[PDB]
Write a protein that binds this ligand. Structure first.
Ligand SMILES: Nc1ncnc2c1ncn2[C@@H]1O[C@H](COP(=O)(O)OP(=O)(O)OP(=O)(O)O)[C@@H](O)[C@H]1O
Ligand SMILES: [Ca+2]
Ligand SMILES: [Mg+2]
Ligand SMILES: [Mn+2]
Ligand code: NA
Ligand code: NA
Ligand code: NA
Length: 473
């Protein structure tokens, strides 16, 4: 139960991780290689098309009523589960990779055909567009009126380019994640505003012979443009085939009921990999995002030259931030989303959350994360590893949060959801690489000392562990 950060303990673990990544192997991803269970010391340069599908009406499900109650969460989870199952079936059918499903954003990757084939990149983009429209068509049909579950309102972003594949740091280190421009830029297009449709970067537009746009985020593909991609890609999978299979899956092996229990403290003991709808976890707690600021551009700068230092930097920083969350502060790392850490923190008893204490300890955790980040940069640089212009943006908020695994057996994905999850990320995104921000709900529940620290702006700079300790004395 002790929650404390220590410079010596952090330095020792950072130094050990630096030693582990002394030798790095960078491989160019070609046919017959595998992106599963990538070792710590290895990374793959992947030329691929990234699609991000944003289910825009998630936030509406979370806000059906003023109070964020149990029924709100059960219906939100069933909505995400139904729609995820449909998309995952589509991706399986077209032999694309499901990278992750983070909140309402579903990331997929198209790597085939390979560049040995003439016009491969054009064909990858065409396949991604055709698959995107299949997602849109299907997700109009995968609600359930009887359960008050709406159809999904979909906005899609697509980019093409190079990324660096490393293991995703969770669940036995099996599945990869993909660092660099294309997943990031695809996600930005997908989340830019609330207009439905399929939005390509200028890279992706150029690859399929379309004129570049001064504002790609406002230039949806037309029906005619999409049809050209469909006719070229020849998916030979129809929306009706997907829906019939999706319905059969749910009939034979239904979702069943969502049922919630609290996590026995400490939160680090949550066994996410084992959760199911009937065994979901839920309680008021703090959602925290710690984003390595500037990391995407750093990868882009190094995608071809000095790529090995990227791998060293990523593993040293992410492993240490995870250790601070889990071992120093007894919290739970949910996932990494690209380079960013998604975490949970809680204080209280087996029966109730201590809101004020949870927010104070999250403030201390935020300081500890920054102290460990700063120390990791120092130690990396002292060993001659280039770390560019990296920073750490942190946001956190308080509210009821449910954790489960969505999907059919063999095709599941973890989900942590709540208004405070969504809002903690928005607070994080408002921060520079030296800033830490708090949500309004957390602020309102906080001690006077925490309120004074964050002030009117609900944000502060250079909040390291020493500063947090002194502010909360
Ligand atoms: N490598 C990645 N893989 C998957 N999703 C990503 C990746 N990088 C960013 N994202 C997502 O892309 C969107 C934009 O991320 P963000 O706001 O952090 O961009 P940024 O601040 O420009 O990047 P950085 O923090 O690396 O400087 C978010 O939805 C985020 O979750
Ligand atoms: Ca980042
Ligand atoms: Mg302030
Ligand atoms: Mn960022
Ligand atoms: Na593919
Ligand atoms: Na501890
Ligand atoms: Na904690």
């Amino acid at each position: 139960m002790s929650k404390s950060w220590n410079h010596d303990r952090a330095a020792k673990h950072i130094d050990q991780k630096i030693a582990d990544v002394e030798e790095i192997t960078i491989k160019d991803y070609v046919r017959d290689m595998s992106l599963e269970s990538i070792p710590t010391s290895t990374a793959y340069r992947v030329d691929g098309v990234h699609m991000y599908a944003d289910i825009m009406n998630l936030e509406d499900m979370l806000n059906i009523t003023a109070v964020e109650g149990t029924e709100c969460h059960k219906r939100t989870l069933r909505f995400l589960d139904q729609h995820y199952r449909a998309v995952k079936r589509i991706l399986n059918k077209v032999d694309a990779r499901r990278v992750d499903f983070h909140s309402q954003r579903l990331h997929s990757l198209f790597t085939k055909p390979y560049n040995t084939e003439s016009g491969a990149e054009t064909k990858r983009v065409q396949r991604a567009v055709a698959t995107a429209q299949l997602i849109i068509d299907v997700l109009a049909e995968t609600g359930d009126d009887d359960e008050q579950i709406p159809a999904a309102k979909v906005r899609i972003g697509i980019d093409t380019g190079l990324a660096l594949a490393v293991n995703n740091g969770r669940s036995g280190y099996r599945e990869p994640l993909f660092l660099g421009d294309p997943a990031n830029h695809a996600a930005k297009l997908a989340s830019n505003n609330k207009a439905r449709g399929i939005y390509l970067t200028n890279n992706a537009r150029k690859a399929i012979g379309l004129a570049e746009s001064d504002e790609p985020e406002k230039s949806a593909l037309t029906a005619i443009e999409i049809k050209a991609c469909q006719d070229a890609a020849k998916l030979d999978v129809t929306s009706d085939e997907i829906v019939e299979e999706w319905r059969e899956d749910l009939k034979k092996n239904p979702i069943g009921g969502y049922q919630f229990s609290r996590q026995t403290p400490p939160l680090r003991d949550m066994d996410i990999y084992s959760l199911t709808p009937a065994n979901s976890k839920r309680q008021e707690m703090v959602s925290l995002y710690a984003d390595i600021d500037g990391f995407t551009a750093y990868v882009a700068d190094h995608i071809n030259e000095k790529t090995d230092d990227v791998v060293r930097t990523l593993h040293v920083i992410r492993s240490e931030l995870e250790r601070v969350v889990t071992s120093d502060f007894e919290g739970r790392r949910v996932r990494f989303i690209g380079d960013c850490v998604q975490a949970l923190s809680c204080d209280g008893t087996a029966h109730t959350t201590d809101e004020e204490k949870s927010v104070s300890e999250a403030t201390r955790l935020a300081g500890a994360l920054r102290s460990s980040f700063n120390l990791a940069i120092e130690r990396l640089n002292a060993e001659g590893i280039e770390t560019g212009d990296l920073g750490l943006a942190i946001g956190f908020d308080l509210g009821p949060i449910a954790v489960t695994r969505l999907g059919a057996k063999g095709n599941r994905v973890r989900c942590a959801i709540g208004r405070s999850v969504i809002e903690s990320e928005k607070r994080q995104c408002a921060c520079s690489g030296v800033e830490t921000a708090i949500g309004q709900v957390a602020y309102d529940a906080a001690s006077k000392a925490v309120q004074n620290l964050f002030g009117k702006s609900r944000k502060t700079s250079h909040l390291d562990y020493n500063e947090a300790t002194e502010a909360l004395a």
